[PDB]
């Protein structure tokens, strides 16, 4: 939508005028003029949006060229800004910088012609404003939306295929067999196969169970490395071994672990199965493979008997729609006939019905909306076999979205097919692109999380992984939605364009690449950069690859010089050895991610990019030294890192009264303990997440820095992590008293502190802490005895400890819901008093002593009797690692 670009340009111009007067100084009148005209433009596009522009040709004619004239302005202003900052570097103290001030004033001549153009067009727009304001529709207020807790996890009317499949498997002893499943896209082969892979009988039967996704763009060796990973810890060794030997190693590991069930998803080409099957050892055991698909030929080839999936009958259809649109509550009677007619209109496709329930949630729950939706569906599914019917249905759902979500959905279609989207990165990309604008009081990140939850609710985006906290950790887009969104973006809106290279084709020429605004290259990238492209109007550049590619020493300069107007640059999948000066000459850079293996210092010139919001760095060295004045970069909001970062020593200005305290700074992913000082925390009042890697001892000792005591100043801090990199128990470490920590702290992580279990009382004293995660021998001992305090703790996580005896009472953990016990191969039993807590719902116990498993089964039987006893308890689910136990 043109509104997005208009708003972003207005905001950036305002920020540049307020903040940096000197750069814009030669053209201030033109800046203010463009500001007024863009405000008026935005109002006009809103008024046009109120109407159905597609209904009138004149309205559609009017919108065109609103966007091009706006685009011409953005270009001229940005070129001017970069030119004048280069002038500042020139340091021409001449009063009249006649040489090359006439170049920045050539850009200003373009600016002036552009201001003249914008003054025009605005006069024509004033014509037809009154006529447009005569008409309006959908005059209503805005309501709230609510978080997407799990709902309808049960699968309507699909027990039949589940039981048939679970029956078929385990037929012939000592045979490696494959179970094909087919059925048109959106039917639910993955959903049913998930229900199988999570049915109790399957987990009872086979010990090893691997979930594997194999699309068309799948890679064989990438898959083998990960499957070997399922068994062992490190794959960096097998980065240097052949696929065949890798196939052999997977075979040995998989054969060792008794039986095995392996799931490969959405296969496309029979040769794909032919190649992948090698790793599986046919060692004369009843091991079952479960592949699903869409094409019939491959299913038939891999086994002469494919099990075809089934459509949902009319009743299943209506019940499913009722569930999705009305969630737990039951439908009010008046809409029943409408909903049943729509369900019948669907023909029993779970995908069409699901998206339609999303559209109904979007419209409302009033009879007029239901009748209109019924009429529209009765029109857009006249055929069955044509997939574009699903596209028409999704378009109908899509039309009702707010334009802000319209931008986010398309931009979520940017990622490659089959790629699992990291939610935090997706939110930060949305922020840096300008799709989320200040409205209200929520922090930008919270608004982004709410937007993602909204998109999940109407069933456009399917969630894949969730956190311990219950939040979302990784999402993606179903194939049909990906195709519809990609076509809509690359064709209509020109949001972005992709450059995947088919056989016997060439990367476009400079004239074509001239008309792009964003690039995505998810295929051979070094090949596009060996050509030395040049497109002055590329603002973003995305490359979400699978492997890590090295960048040749003679090829580093190409990105900075080819695209001198970047804003977003995510090349996390490309490893750099260094950087060139043109890099530090990129002055519009907002988002910047990159990897590296020999980087140790963040050069100081990097602090001259005065618009950076986000920074993400990967480095193999333990210590990363930062020399750029991050206290100078006003708008910095995040600084991620995987090594231990050594922040610079802060100094306030001497001749300037102004103090350097960043109000908008929310993260310091991993800083060294040496910098956990009073001043570092004086400068970050609003900090919400902090991490410290290094030798946690320096913190805990009270000589060098009362560092844990320094932590008291961060009032809003809500997440902390203590990572120790020393591998030597030089002394014993002691946590300070529980009045030093912040009050809202909600999630803590320890790793190799090696603390004594008596200190757990201090943590019990904390009030709001909701998740405790101690990994890799965080607390050392053999005797912990609960002493109360964990009033609100919701998830407990213990991994790689030598604890033996634990003792508690049902009043120690009143709100427990989740309990994680990993790699505790020296614990004996879990206290049974944990079976008394009502909310205790999920437990898991990995690589643990079998006596603990027997006690856990006792606890499960206890809670089963409780729920049987008429209490309104939440259902009980257990998990014990041993297949036998």
Ligand X SMILES: O=P(O)(O)O[C@H]1[C@H](OP(=O)(O)O)[C@@H](OP(=O)(O)O)[C@H](OP(=O)(O)O)[C@@H](OP(=O)(O)O)[C@H]1OP(=O)(O)O
Give the Cα separation of 407 and 489 in Å (integer).
Answer: 9
Count of residues of this chain found to bind a second copy when the rule CB under 8 A is applied: 34
Q: How far is the CB of 545 from a second copy (least distance, A)?
A: 11
User: CB of 361: closest distance to ligand X in angstroms?
Assistant: 28
Is residue 773 a known part of a binding site? yes
* Residues composing the chain: 885
**Which one of ligand X, ligand ADP, a second copy, none interacts with residue 203, CB within 5 to 8 A by kind?**
none
Which one of ligand ADP, a second copy, ligand X, none is in contact with 189 (Cβ closer than 5 to 8 A by kind)? ligand ADP
Q: Which of residues 328-387 bind a second copy (CB under 8 A)?
A: none
Residue 682 corresponds to which tokens in the numbers above? 């004086």
Query: Contacts from 653-660 at CB under 8 Å and sequence distance 24+?
Result: 660/631, 660/632
Nearest approach in angstroms of CB 38 to ligand X is: 37
633 lies in the binding site for ligand X (CB under 6 A):
no
Our separate counts of H helices and E strands in the chain read 31, 31
Judge whether 33 and 72 are in contact, CB under 8 Å.
no
- Say whether 807 counts as a known binding-site residue: no
Among 127, 554, 658, 728, binds a second copy (CB under 8 A): 554
511 burial level (CB within 10 Å; 0-12, 13-18, 19+): exposed
Judged by CB under 6 A, which of 33, 619, 719, 848 binds ligand X?
A: 719
One-character DSSP codes across 446-488? HHHHHHHHHHHHTTSSEEEEE-SSS-EEEEE--HHHHHHHHHH
CB of 384 to ligand ADP, least distance (A): 16
749 binds ligand X (CB under 6 A): yes
- 749 appears as a binding residue in the annotation: yes
Q: From CA 550, how far away is CA 523, in angstroms rounded?
A: 14
Q: Are 718 and 747 in contact (CB under 8 A)?
A: yes
Contacts to a second copy from residues 506-545, by CB under 8 A: 509-511, 526, 530-534
> Cα–Cα distance between 540 and 523 in angstroms, integer?
17
3-state class of 755 per DSSP? strand
* C-alpha closest to that of 762 among 836, 700, 693: 700
If one asks whether residue 828 binds ligand X (CB under 6 A), the answer comes out as no
Cα–Cα distance measured from residue 303 to residue 270, given in angstroms and rounded to the nearest whole number:
11
- Closest approach of ligand X to the CB of residue 642, in Å: 6
473 sits near ligand X (criterion: CB under 6 A):
yes
- Judged by beta carbon distances under 5 to 8 A according to partner kind, the member of ligand ADP, ligand X, a second copy, none in contact with residue 473 is ligand X
Q: Tell me which residues in 792-811 interact with a second copy (CB under 8 A).
A: none
Partner interacting with residue 467 (select from ligand ADP, a second copy, ligand X, none; CB below 5-8 Å by kind): ligand X
List binders of a second copy among 224-253 (CB under 8 A): 239-245
Phi-psi region of 347 (alpha: psi -120 to 50; beta: other; left: phi over 0): left
755 phi, psi to nearest 5 deg: -95, 160
295 binds a second copy per the rule CB under 8 A: no
Residue burial 543-562, b: 16+ Cβ < 10 Å; e: rest: bbbeeeeebeeeebebbbeb
Q: Does residue 469 belong to the site contacting ligand X (CB under 6 A)?
A: yes
Check the annotation: does 63 bind a ligand. Answer: no
In the complex, the residues that contact ligand ADP under the rule CB under 6 A are 155-158, 185-191, 266, 312, 320, 350-351, 354, 459, 462, 478
Q: Which is nearer to ligand ADP, 148 or 434 (CB)?
A: 148
Each residue of 280-296: b (16+ CB within 10 Å) or e?
bbeeeebbbbbbbbbee
Report the alpha-carbon angle 217-452-474, nearest 5: 45
Nearer to ligand ADP, 158 or 591 (CB): 158
Tell me which of ligand X, a second copy, ligand ADP, none is bound by residue 188, counting a contact when its beta carbon lies within the kind-specific cut-off of 5 to 8 angstroms: ligand ADP
**Of a second copy, ligand X, ligand ADP, none, which one does residue 771 interact with (CB within 5 to 8 Å by kind)?**
ligand X
Say whether 736 counts as a known binding-site residue.
Answer: no
The gap between the terminal CA atoms of the chain, to the nearest Å, is: 57
Asked whether the beta carbons of 50 and 29 are under 8 A apart, the reply is no
- Judged by CB under 6 A, which of 357, 381, 771, 803 binds ligand X? 771
For residue 749, the partner it binds in a second copy, ligand X, ligand ADP, none, with Cβ less than 5 to 8 A by kind, is ligand X
Residues 620-659 that bind a second copy (CB under 8 A): none
Distance (Å, rounded) from C-alpha 754 to C-alpha 226? 31
Indicate the residue among 287 and 618 with the shorter CB distance to ligand X: 618
142 is in an annotated binding site: no
What is the rounded CA–CA span in Å between residue 731 and residue 280? 49
- Write b or e for each residue in 783-819: b if 16 or more Cβ atoms lie within 10 A of its Cβ, otherwise e: ebebeebbeebbbbbbbbbebeebebebebbeebbbb
The footprint of a second copy (CB under 8 A) covers 221, 239-245, 502-504, 509-511, 526, 530-534, 547, 549-550, 552-555, 557-558, 561, 575, 577, 597-598
State the binding site.
154, 156, 186-191, 324, 350, 462, 467-468, 473, 478, 640, 669, 689, 719, 721, 747, 749, 773, 775
The footprint of ligand X (CB under 6 A) covers 467-469, 473, 691, 719, 721, 747, 749, 771
State the binding site for ADP.
154, 156, 186-191, 324, 350, 462, 478
């Amino acid at each position: 939508m043109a509104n997005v670009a208009v708003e972003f340009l207005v905001e950036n111009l305002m920020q540049l005028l307020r903040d940096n007067v000197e750069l814009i100084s030669g053209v201030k009148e033109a800046a203010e003029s463009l500001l007024q005209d863009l405000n008026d433009f935005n109002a006009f596009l809103k008024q046009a949006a109120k109407c159905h522009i597609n209904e009138n040709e004149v309205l559609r004619e009017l919108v065109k060229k609103i966007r091009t004239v706006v685009n011409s302005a953005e270009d001229a202003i940005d070129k001017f800004v970069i030119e004048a900052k280069l002038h500042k570097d020139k340091g021409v103290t001449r009063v009249l910088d006649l040489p090359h001030y006439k170049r920045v004033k050539e850009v200003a001549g373009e600016i002036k012609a552009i201001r003249n153009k914008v003054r025009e067009i605005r006069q024509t727009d004033a014509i037809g404003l009154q006529a447009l304001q005569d008409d309006d529709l959908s005059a209503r207020g805005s309501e709230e939306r609510k978080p997407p807790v799990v709902e309808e996890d049960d699968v309507v009317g699909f027990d039949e295929e589940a039981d048939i499949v679970i029956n078929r498997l385990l037929g012939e002893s000592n045979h490696l067999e494959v179970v094909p499943v087919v059925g048109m896209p959106g039917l639910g082969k993955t959903t049913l196969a998930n229900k199988i892979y999570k049915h109790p009988k399957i987990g009872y039967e086979f010990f090893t169970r691997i979930w594997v996704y194999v699309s068309q763009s799948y890679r064989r060796r990438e898959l083998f490395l990960n499957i070997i990973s399922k068994f062992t810890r490190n794959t960096k060794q097998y980065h240097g071994m052949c696929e065949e030997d890798l196939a052999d190693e997977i075979q040995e590991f998989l054969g060792k672990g008794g039986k095995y069930l392996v799931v490969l998803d959405d296969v496309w080409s029979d040769e794909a199965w032919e190649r992948i099957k090698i790793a599986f050892p046919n060692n004369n055991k009843p091991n079952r493979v479960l592949l699903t698909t869409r094409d019939s030929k491959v299913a038939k080839q891999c086994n002469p008997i494919p099990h075809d999936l089934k459509f949902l009958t009319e009743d299943e259809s209506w019940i499913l729609l009722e569930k999705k649109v009305f969630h737990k509550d039951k439908c009010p009677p008046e809409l029943v006939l409408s909903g049943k007619s729509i369900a019948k209109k669907c023909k029993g496709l779970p995908l069409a019905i699901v998206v339609i329930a999303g559209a109904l949630i979007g419209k409302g729950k009033t009879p007029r909306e239901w009748k209109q939706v019924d009429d529209s569906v009765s029109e857009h599914l006249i055929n069955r076999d044509h997939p574009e019917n699903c596209n028409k249905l999704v378009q109908m759902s899509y039309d009702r979205l707010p334009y802000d979500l319209k931008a986010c959905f398309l931009y979520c279609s940017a990622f490659p097919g089959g790629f699992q989207i990291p939610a935090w990165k997706l939110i930060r990309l949305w922020i840096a692109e300008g799709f989320i604008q200040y409205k209200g009081h929520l922090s930008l990140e919270c608004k982004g999380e709410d937007n993602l939850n909204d998109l999940i609710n109407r069933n456009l985006v399917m969630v894949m992984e969730r956190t311990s906290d219950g939040q979302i950790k990784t999402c993606r887009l179903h194939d049909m939605l990906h195709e519809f969104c990609r076509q809509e973006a690359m064709k209509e809106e020109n949001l972005f364009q992709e450059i995947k290279l088919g056989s016997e084709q060439y990367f476009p020429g400079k004239r074509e690449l001239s008309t792009y605004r964003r690039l995505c290259i998810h295929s051979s990238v070094l090949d596009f950069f060996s050509t030395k492209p040049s497109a002055e109007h590329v603002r973003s550049f995305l490359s979400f690859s699978s492997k890590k590619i090295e960048m040749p020493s003679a090829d580093i300069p190409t990105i900075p010089k080819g695209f001198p107007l970047l804003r977003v640059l995510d090349v996390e999948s490309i490893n750099f050895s260094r950087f060139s000066r043109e890099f530090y000459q990129l002055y519009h850079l907002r988002y910047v991610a990159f990897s590296s293996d020999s980087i140790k210092i963040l050069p100081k010139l990097m602090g001259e990019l005065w618009n950076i919001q986000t920074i993400i760095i990967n480095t193999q060295q333990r210590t990363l030294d930062i020399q750029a004045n991050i206290w100078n970069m006003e708008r910095l909001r995040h600084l991620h890192t995987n090594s231990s970062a050594k922040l610079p020593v802060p100094v306030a200005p001497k001749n300037s009264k102004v103090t350097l305290v960043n109000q908008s700074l929310q993260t310091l992913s991993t800083i060294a303990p040496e910098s956990c000082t009073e001043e570092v925390f004086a400068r970050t009042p609003n900090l919400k997440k902090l991490g410290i890697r290094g030798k946690i001892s320096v913190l805990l000792d009270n000589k060098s820095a009362a560092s844990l005591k320094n932590v008291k100043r961060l009032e809003y801090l809500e997440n902390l992590k203590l990572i120790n990199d020393s591998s030597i128990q030089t002394s014993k470490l002691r946590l300070p008293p529980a009045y030093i920590f912040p009050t809202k702290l909600r999630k803590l992580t320890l790793l190799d502190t090696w603390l004594e279990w008596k200190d757990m009382s201090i943590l019990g004293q904390l009030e709001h802490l909701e998740v405790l995660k101690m990994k890799e021998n965080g607390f050392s001992g053999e005797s912990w005895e609960s002493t109360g305090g964990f009033c609100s703790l919701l998830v407990l996580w213990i991994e790689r400890t030598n604890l033996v005896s634990w003792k508690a009472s049902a009043d120690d953990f009143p709100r427990l819901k989740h309990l994680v016990l990993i790699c505790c191969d020296n614990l004996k039993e879990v206290p049974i008093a944990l079976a008394d807590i009502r909310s205790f719902q999920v437990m898991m116990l990995q690589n643990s002593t079998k006596t603990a498993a027997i006690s856990a089964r006792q606890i499960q039987a206890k809670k089963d009797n409780q729920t049987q006893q008429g209490t309104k308890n939440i259902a009980f689910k257990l998990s014990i690692f041993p297949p036998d136990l």
